[PDB]
Design a binder for this molecule. Structure first.
Ligand SMILES: CCCCCCCCCCCCCCCCCC(=O)OC[C@H](COP(=O)([O-])OCC(O)COP(=O)([O-])OC[C@@H](COC(=O)CCCCCCCCCCCCCCCCC)OC(=O)CCCCCCCCCCCCCCCCC)OC(=O)CCCCCCCCCCCCCCCCC
Ligand SMILES: CCCCCCCCCCCCCCCCCC(=O)OC[C@H](COP(=O)([O-])OCC(O)COP(=O)([O-])OC[C@@H](COC(=O)CCCCCCCCCCCCCCCCC)OC(=O)CCCCCCCCCCCCCCCCC)OC(=O)CCCCCCCCCCCCCCCCC
Ligand SMILES: CCCCCCCCCCCCCCCCC[C@@H](O)O[C@H](CO[C@H](O)CCCCCCCCCCCCCCC)COP(=O)(O)OCC[N+](C)(C)C
Ligand SMILES: N[C@@H](Cc1ccc(O)cc1)C(=O)O
Lengths: 57, 458
């Protein structure tokens, strides 16, 4: 009672039921370094301007 | 102090919008008015300076220099309009523009609160002077003179710039008040020695120091009359003003870094005074005179005492007036006879008596006859040098003997003796020339009447 598969049936993406737990770190990755924290707060004008040599603005 | 700066910037378009035959009148009138306005800066305090704003301030050292600059502009205009009569209107306006720009740069230089702004203006003064010399000089040597004037200056000032920015990376400021209040001693290391040299050599070449002075006879001889006036009277004093400003951060290194410069100044003062005794060109004699007087000023600044600083200030003001007057006196004869050889025109007292009186008074102030401010500055410097070392009175003494000699020599060569027979084109003195001489000489004696106005902050 065997039926030959039709054209395009063996190439389907199927689903499988398994009791094997999904691995959590299959790449054996290290802990990622922490990023530079952030930019926060409101922007205020530069204190005393550019402060470049004699310029007061 | 924009009440002085803005009127000069207004002189600029006033000159460029004037009618073709009114440029000299308008320029002279408004220059004199600006000098009158600048006269108010002489009201100084005993404790600190007049701090007008974050950018400009006035001290008891810079106020007489500003007054001298603003007073010299109209005299330069009066002296220039004779030999520029054949010039086109546009070129005359360009010449007046150069003079005005030079005055503006000098005014801003003497009052800048920061050292880099001071450096920028003190280099900016180079361009109008070089243009005046190389465009309106009379002989072919002017071009060479211009080159000698430029690189001699820049080879001194480029290291200074580096030092300046280095200092701002170390102390955080170049403001002169902050620099004075937060002063720290200089240790004895090679780095500090080269910093001292970088801070000093530009002003040394500006004075100029003996051995670094070769640019000055060329530039001051080849220049037109206004160029020579402003070179001798004001531009040489930039070095002294800058040295007295910069020495506040160089202690106690100066205590022994001054020895080569002190030796050079004293011996070269003797040497240039001696050179004045054998000179065939009348303008070169006046230039070497300037070198000797500036050597005295260098000694005064290097020994770093209150009496020496007062003497240096008085000597700079007095020399400016006297040397400008002497250059104008020589220019009158040059315009008459078209030659700078001193022995060509002789016995001029017989032909021009009042001009001979002007010559006598100018040569009397050159040899520091008491109680002229020339003598006051010279005597203060000599007393301070005597305190520094009792042996200096030898060299200084010799200088006092030589100066008078060559001074009187000049007079005796030009005014006395018999007139040259074949020179028949000596016209009577114009009102303009007599007025120029009077406007030079009267302020000198008026300042003698009240000498504390030119004695500086000490
Ligand atoms: C019509 C004119 C008009 O409407 O006037 C309004 C305006 C009113 O402004 P203000 O706040 O009342 O002026 C306050 C004080 O003037 C003082 O104002 P300040 O303290 O805010 O100064 C402004 C500041 C920033 O402004 C600037 O930097 C530009 C100023 C030009 C420099 C001058 C060079 C040529 C002139 O200037 C500086 O920092 C000084 C540096 C200048 C040196 C430039 C470097 C080159 C070397 C010299 C050559 O008047 C002007 O702009 C002044 C005339 C220019
Ligand atoms: C000491 C006497 C005090 C008198 C009281 C009033 C004095 C008023 C004088 C006002 C300032 C003088 C104006 C300067 C420009 C010269 C005028 C001119 O161009 O001639 C046209 C005018 C027209 O005559 P001219 O017929 O056409 O003949 C002209 C020919 O070219 C040929 O003309 P010349 O052959 O007749 O010669 C012209 C005359 C004019 O040439 C000059 O030499 C006059 C300029 C003075 C010399 C500048 C370098 C010396 C440095 C000292 C600075 C002192 C200034 C004090 C403050 C002055 C305030 C403005 O030269 C001389 O006669 C010989 C000069 C040798 C002077 C030796 C004295 C050295 C200092 C001695 C004391 C000084 C301090 C006094 C207090 C001391 C402690 C008590 O000539 C005259 O009228 C004669 C001039 C008068 C001689 C004044 C000599 C003494 C005054 C010295 C300073 C004044 C101190 C006053 C405070 C009170 C004491
Ligand atoms: C034409 C006129 C131009 C303008 C004139 C400018 C004048 C510049 C002269 C510089 C003055 C002194 C500079 C440095 C101070 C001392 C120099 C040295 O001779 O003194 C001894 C230095 O010892 C030896 O002499 C080493 C220096 C020898 C090498 C320098 C070359 C000089 C030869 C002459 C070359 C000409 C230079 C000018 C070119 C125009 C002191 O012993 P020492 O205590 O250990 O050094 C002090 C510094 N410390 C503390 C950090 C160690
Ligand atoms: N630096 C001096 C200047 C001065 C000189 C003579 C005076 O009469 C007054 C002031 C102070 O003291």
């Amino acid at each position: 009672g065997w039926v030959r598969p039709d054209l395009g049936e063996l190439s389907k993406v199927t689903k499988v039921k398994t009791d094997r737990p999904l691995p959590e770190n299959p790449y054996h990755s290290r802990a990622r370094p922490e990023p530079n924290p952030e930019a926060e707060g409101d922007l205020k004008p530069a204190k005393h301007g550019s402060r470049l040599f004699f310029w007061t603005m | 102090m924009l009440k002085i700066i803005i009127p000069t910037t207004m002189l600029l378009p006033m000159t460029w919008m004037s009618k073709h035959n009114m440029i000299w009148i308008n320029a002279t009138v408004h220059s004199l008015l600006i000098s009158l306005i600048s006269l108010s800066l002489l009201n100084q305090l005993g404790e600190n300076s007049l701090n007008f704003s974050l950018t400009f301030f006035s001290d008891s050292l810079s106020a007489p220099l500003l007054v001298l600059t603003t007073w010299l502009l109209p005299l330069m205009l009066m002296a220039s309009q004779s030999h520029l009569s054949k010039e086109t209107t546009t070129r005359k306006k360009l010449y007046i523009t150069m003079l005005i720009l030079l005055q503006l740069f000098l005014i801003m230089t003497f009052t800048a609160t920061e050292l880099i702004l001071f450096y920028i203006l003190f280099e900016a003064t180079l361009v109008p002077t070089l243009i005046i010399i190389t465009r309106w000089g009379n002989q072919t040597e002017r071009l060479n003179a211009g080159l000698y004037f430029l690189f001699y200056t820049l080879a001194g000032s480029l290291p200074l710039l580096v030092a300046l920015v280095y200092i701002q990376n170390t102390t955080g400021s170049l403001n002169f008040l902050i620099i004075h209040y937060w002063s720290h001693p200089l240790s004895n290391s090679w780095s500090n020695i080269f910093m001292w040299l970088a801070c000093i050599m530009a002003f040394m070449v500006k004075m100029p120091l003996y051995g670094l002075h070769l640019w000055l006879p060329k530039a001051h001889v080849e220049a037109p009359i206004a160029g020579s006036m402003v070179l001798a009277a004001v531009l040489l004093k930039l070095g002294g003003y800058g040295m007295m400003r910069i020495t506040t951060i160089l202690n106690p290194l100066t205590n022994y870094m001054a020895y080569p410069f002190l030796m050079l100044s004293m011996w070269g003062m003797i040497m240039t005074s001696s050179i004045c005794l054998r000179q065939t060109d009348l303008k070169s004699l006046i230039a070497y005179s300037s070198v000797s007087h500036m050597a005295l000023v260098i000694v005064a600044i290097m020994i770093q005492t209150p009496w020496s600083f007062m003497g240096a200030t008085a000597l700079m003001i007095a020399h400016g007036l006297t040397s400008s007057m002497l250059f104008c006196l020589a220019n009158t004869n040059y315009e008459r006879v078209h030659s700078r050889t001193m022995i060509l025109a002789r016995g001029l007292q017989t032909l021009l008596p009042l001009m001979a009186t002007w010559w006598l008074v100018a040569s009397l102030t050159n040899l520091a006859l008491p109680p002229s401010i020339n003598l006051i500055g010279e005597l203060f410097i000599i007393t301070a040098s005597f305190s520094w070392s009792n042996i200096t009175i030898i060299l200084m003494g010799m200088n006092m003997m030589i100066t008078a000699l060559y001074s009187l020599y000049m007079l005796i060569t030009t005014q006395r003796g018999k007139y040259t027979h074949h020179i028949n084109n000596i016209k009577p003195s114009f009102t303009r020339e007599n007025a120029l001489m009077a406007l030079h000489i009267l302020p000198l004696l008026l300042l003698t009447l009240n000498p504390k106005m030119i004695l500086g902050p000490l």
